[PDB]
């Protein structure tokens, strides 16, 4: 009644707060906590830090910490424990290159038990928002470091947060219980069991049978026709949030024939996205015309959508010299067929379904898309090294969008750098992304985001497909299930059946 059972496609991992896979971000966020806490309005509030000051040049910050917080094993949280966490994270600095605060922090020291001083290389504006992320700047008890580090593993995953990992059984389940000595608000739920169920259909079956009480996740959570059925079944409860991030193709500007602007612009008019969403996504998601929805901070720019218009796509191709050989449906230019490889995770039925639609729509304008569905490791390798024509991709949701997603475009081992590498203006874009991150002149910050997002739109680097939502299927007794401000978090401590 105050215990729930839910599911996740894999175990939560070791819950090292400072590492990535196989740790699951939402589980790191249940056990470990930040200095400051992200809010839906884009601000942060005091959290383990009660307050803070900064220097006039914006580079030196001093946080006053709570003095009443203990880790779940009774050891105190104080500035020394925080400073040792920052050292453990930055001892592995290379791994966090995607996150610009990890390159900005030049020193962290405890000035006393309650005062923590962080010095930055520059006046990095997103500092507090990156400190609020699920990882890596959250705090494990230093006693649980292994030989004074975390990058080589941890002992027990001891955090300050409202949940404690009770036990994990690999390939089976993970069980958390409420922290009875939490410094903040006491959750209503006392125990949460996660059953490991990798297949979406099997998840839906688990819920119908009553084996689980709650499913919570993005558009991959369960089959969408099933979800629509469940939303009409008065024995169940369902929800669909307002959109949290964009799903899009990345087009390789450095690889033929996507290296041609006119080919990328044509592809951007070839897909009927509303039909795609109604055919493959059961009508449950929203059409996307831009990298970021106009509701994302800094991104209400009046960018012009490319509406589905196969006549215009064909015209653009014809004008660029891609015309149809006698008796053939696939265009050719300089003897080369207009062929494009579309990469995605082959096991993933929803991705395959979308890819088949996109392939069919692009065949109608004379582009031959070849589907390359591979296991996830091979797709991630392709993202990193630029071995793709088109690849499925997504943004990151709040509080990463847009700043941190844009920051990462500079990192060479990410899909977006690779996709953009054929642009003559790539250096300028990357210089402008560095400038926007440290700008405190609000007019210049808006102007730099407008320039970067407008160049990316006008160069047709992406094919935005949908703004996707979180969705929930639950037993009615759990009541209304809230959403967290951070798109990757699950706010279990806010569920309040009574």
Curated annotation (Swiss-Prot):
This is Nickel-binding periplasmic protein. GO terms for biological process: negative chemotaxis; nickel cation import across plasma membrane; nickel cation transport; peptide transport. It is found in: Periplasm. The keyword Signal applies. It holds the Pfam family SBP_bac_5. One of its GO terms (molecular function) is metal cluster binding. It comes from the Bacteria. Involved in a nickel transport system, probably represents the nickel binder. Keywords: Nickel, Periplasm, Signal, Transport. It comes from Escherichia coli (strain K12). PROSITE patterns: SBP_BACTERIAL_5. One of its GO terms (cellular component) is periplasmic space. The gene is nikA. Belongs to the bacterial solute-binding protein 5 family.
């Amino acid at each position: 009644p105050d215990e729930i059972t839910t599911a996740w496609p894999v175990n939560v991992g070791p819950l090292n707060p400072h590492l990535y896979t196989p740790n699951q971000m939402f589980a790191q966020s249940m056990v470990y906590e930040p200095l400051v806490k992200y809010q839906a309005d884009g601000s942060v509030i005091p959290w383990l830090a009660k307050s803070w000051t900064h220097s006039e040049d914006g580079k030196t910050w001093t946080f006053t910490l709570r003095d009443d917080v203990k880790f779940s094993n009774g050891e105190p949280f104080d500035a020394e424990a925080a400073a040792e966490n920052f050292r453990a994270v930055l001892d592995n600095r290379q791994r966090h290159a995607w996150l610009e605060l990890a390159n900005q922090i030049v020193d962290v020291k405890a000035l006393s038990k309650t005062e923590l001083q962080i010095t930055l290389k520059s006046a990095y504006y997103p500092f507090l928002q990156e400190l609020a992320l699920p990882r890596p700047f959250r705090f494990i008890a230093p006693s649980q470091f292994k030989n004074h580090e975390t990058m080589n593993g941890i002992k027990a995953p001891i955090g300050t947060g409202p949940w404690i990992l009770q036990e994990s059984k690999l390939n089976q389940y993970d069980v958390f219980v409420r922290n009875e000595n939490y410094w903040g608000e006491k959750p209503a739920i006392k125990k949460i069991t996660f059953n490991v169920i990798p297949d979406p259909t099997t998840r839906a079956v688990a819920f119908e049978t009553g084996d689980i009480d709650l499913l919570y996740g993005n558009e991959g959570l369960l089959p969408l026709d099933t979800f629509a059925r469940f939303s009409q079944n008065p024995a169940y409860h369902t929800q669909l949030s307002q959109p949290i991030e964009t799903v899009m193709l990345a087009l390789n500007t450095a690889k033929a024939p996507t290296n041609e602007l006119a080919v990328r612009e044509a592809l951007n008019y070839a897909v009927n996205k509303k039909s795609l969403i109604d055919n493959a996504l059961y009508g449950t998601q929203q059409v996307a015309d831009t990298l970021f929805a106009p509701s994302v901070p800094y991104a209400n720019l009046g960018l012009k959508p490319s509406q589905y218009d196969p006549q215009k796509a064909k015209a653009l191709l014809e004008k660029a010299g891609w015309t149809l050989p006698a008796g053939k449906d696939i265009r050719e230019k300089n003897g080369q067929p207009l062929r494009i490889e579309l990469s995605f995770i082959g096991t993933d039925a929803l991705s395959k379904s979308m890819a088949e639609i996109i392939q069919a729509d692009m065949r109608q304008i004379g582009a031959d898309v070849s589907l390359i569905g591979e296991e996830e490791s091979s797709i991630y390798a392709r993202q990193r090294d630029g071995r793709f024509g088109m690849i499925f991709h997504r943004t990151w949701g709040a509080p990463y969008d847009p700043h941190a997603f844009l920051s990462s475009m500079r990192v060479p081992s990410h899909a977006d750098f690779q996709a953009q590498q054929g642009l003559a203006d790539k250096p300028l874009i990357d210089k402008e992304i560095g400038e926007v991150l440290a700008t405190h002149d609000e007019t210049q910050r808006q102007a730099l985001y407008r320039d970067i997002l407008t160049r990316l739109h006008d160069e047709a680097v992406y094919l935005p497909i949908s703004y996707i939502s979180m969705m929930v299927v639950s037993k009615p007794e759990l009541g209304n299930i809230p959403y967290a401000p951070i798109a990757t978090e699950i706010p279990f401590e806010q569920i309040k059946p009574v």
